[PDB]
């Protein structure tokens, strides 16, 4: 099944206006979303695929640092340095480009 593989991991920015019924409040504002084109919803840290693993905590639903630290050592030293980001509810920082 190698004949239908994807290209590469691509994170995007969906710059979005709104409908003419809701842009009455500040019409020159545009929202910019953030999507993943390649990849999937991942839940368990792959113990065998650690070298090829590029963790992308790009969304607040999917930026759980309890498993995102075991995929890159920068995030691991980030979470063992900073104690306030153990709680998965929020406050764990998002990438500033996103």
């Amino acid at each position: 099944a190698v004949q239908f593989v994807g290209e590469h991991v691509k994170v995007l920015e969906v710059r979005a206006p709104l409908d003419h019924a809701q842009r009455q409040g500040l019409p020159d504002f545009i929202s910019r979303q953030h999507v993943l084109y390649n990849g999937c919803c991942v839940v368990t840290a792959p113990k065998t695929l650690i070298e090829y693993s590029l963790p992308v905590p790009f969304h607040r639903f999917y930026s759980n640092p309890t498993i995102c630290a075991a995929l890159s050592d920068d995030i691991k030293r980030y979470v063992t340095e900073f104690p306030h980001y153990h709680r998965h509810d929020g406050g764990f920082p998002l990438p500033t480009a996103f």
């Binding site: 099944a1 004949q3 239908f4 593989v5 994807g6 390649n38 999937c40 839940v43 368990t44 695929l49």
Partner: protein
Amino acid sequence: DYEETLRLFKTTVTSPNYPELCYLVDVLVHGNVDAFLLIRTFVARCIVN
């Protein structure tokens, strides 16, 4: 008969022992439909196993 469905779904998304093949084959099919027709007999044993 939907409470068993959400029960199995929660126990398989919160599972620590999820098989780590699923990410590679998910990015390998890349949401294509004709790529899955060859995996039509690969998934049929792994699901039951």
